[PDB]
Each structure stands twice: as C-alpha cells, then as structure tokens.
Amino acid sequence: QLHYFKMHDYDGNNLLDGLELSTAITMSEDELINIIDGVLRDDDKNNDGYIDYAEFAK
C-alpha cells in the first residue's frame, strides 16, 4: 500500500504531484486535467499541490 504511494514517486520526494499522477492515469487532455484536479481537491488538504502518504492513505 505504501508500495502504491511509491509506484509513481519517480523523483523520490515521498510526494505525488499532478505530473506524477498524469502518468499513472495515461485520452483527452481535458479528461486528464479533470481527473487530476479532482484527485487534488479530494486529497490535498494543505494546498501545496502535492500529496503525502497522510493525504494519500486518508
């Protein structure tokens, strides 16, 4: 499960951002921007624009 927070932390910072999430998902840009923007809203409780394992595992 940490395994899945990590699958796409390609730069190793222990955070998931929009671009790292983009690749997990990839379809029309618009649909992509839609899903990512959703994931942010839903999970990004601090508005840094990243999601940590807290925010990830909820």
Partner: protein, 226 residues
C-alpha cells in the same frame, strides 16, 4: 511565502512525453523534440528554432519557476541561446530566440552569442515588452535590458537551473551554474523592481541557432503559485 505546485504549467521526466510524442499541457513547435527525460528545444544544427509554451494560460498574482537545462556544444563559442517566457500570447514561431516578437510580458534570455562585439557573453538578460517593441537581436537587447548579469551557462558538468520569481512587482532571477549537484546552490543574477505583467498568460521556453549551433535541452520546467 507558501508555494503551491502548478502541474498544468510544468513538465519533467522521466516520462515527459506521452505515447503520441506530445508533452501534456504544453504545445511545442519549430524543431523542438520532446523525449522522455528532456526536450531538446533547439538542436545543434544550423538555423534552428523551437519553442514549448503552455496551452492554458495561468491566473497567478505572484509566482516562481525553476528551470533546469543544459546548453552543450563543441566550441568555446556557441549560439544562439535560450529564453524563458511569461506573456499574454503564445510566441511559438518567431525570430526571438525561436519565439514570436512583440511579446506582451517578460522574457529572460540566456545569450550564448556576443552579437554586438562587446565581449560580454554568455549572458542573462531581462526584457519587458508591452506589445510594440522589437528585440535588438544584433545588439543582444542591451538597450532594452531591464536588468541583466553575466554567467557562463554552457557546457557544465551538472545541469544549470534558473529560479525566476515574481513577488510583489519584483521579478527575481537566481541561477545555479551547474558546478555542484546541489539543485539549491543558487547565486544572485538580477532583479527588476516595480514590474507589471499580464494578469494571465502563458509560460514558455524557446531556443535557436544560426551560423553556430548548440543543443538546448530543458529537463524540467516547474511552476509555483505563491
């Protein structure tokens, strides 16, 4: 100040290009090649032009961009250089380091080539343009230079990084000269007090060659809402 990462205005490797050869949320053009770990904005060929510019615009009052690039070539002298952009309009095709002229906003020029014989290059240059000025290519914009400095960004053993902050009408430009791998080992380049730029615009990056030619590679363009 806090930083929010703005993914819709950013790119980077290791999966930088989509399966169809495109860069999410950015439009690329001229002779710029996206690849998985960098974009070669302008290749070490004669008379080349390329650009990468965001699709959407971005409504950010204050912001910061960190740009990592390499400018490689055989010679101790190379051309033509590389430009980072904020502006109201996508300047995809044009004579200004591969981008359009008459730009509405700011543009920071990493100028490999001493065009006005002043032995003052390679050099970093800031230039404002309200929609009606013309970039003085042959004079390395020296007269329109809102501010500027002189670092040698070519042929470094780690990649160069340019932090470019706009905070309270003051665009600031720190630069990390590729000498250490401390991505945060920045040093002061320049600054422009009391500057206004469009409420919403595109971010952009472009480069070009002519008689002489370098590879201009941008590994990542990372954008922050402050």
């Amino acid at each position: 100040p806090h930083r929010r990462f703005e993914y819709k205005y950013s790119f980077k490797g290791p999966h930088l290009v989509q399966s169809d050869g495109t860069v999410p949320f950015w439009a690329h053009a001229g002779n710029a090649i996206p690849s998985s770990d960098q974009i070669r904005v302008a290749p070490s060929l004669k008379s080349q032009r390329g650009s990468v510019w965001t699709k959407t615009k971005a409504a950010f009052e204050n912001w910061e961009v960190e740009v990592t690039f390499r400018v490689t070539g055989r010679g101790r002298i190379g051309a033509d250089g590389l430009a980072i952009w904020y502006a109201e309009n996508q300047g995809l095709e044009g004579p200004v380091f591969g981008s359009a002229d008459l730009w509405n906003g700011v543009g920071i020029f990493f100028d490999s080539f001493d065009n006005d014989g002043k032995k003052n290059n390679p050099a970093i240059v800031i230039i404002g343009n309200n929609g009606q000025i013309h970039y003085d290519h042959q004079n390395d914009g020296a007269s329109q230079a809102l501010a500027s400095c002189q670092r040698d960004f070519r042929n470094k053993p780690y990649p160069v990084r340019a932090k470019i902050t706009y905070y309270q009408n003051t665009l600031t430009v720190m630069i990390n000269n590729g000498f250490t791998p401390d991505k945060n080992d920045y040093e002061f380049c320049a600054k422009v007090e009391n500057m206004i730029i469009p409420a919403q615009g595109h971010f952009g990056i472009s480069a070009a060659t002519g008689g002489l030619a370098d590879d201009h590679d941008v590994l990542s363009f990372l954008t922050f809402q402050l």
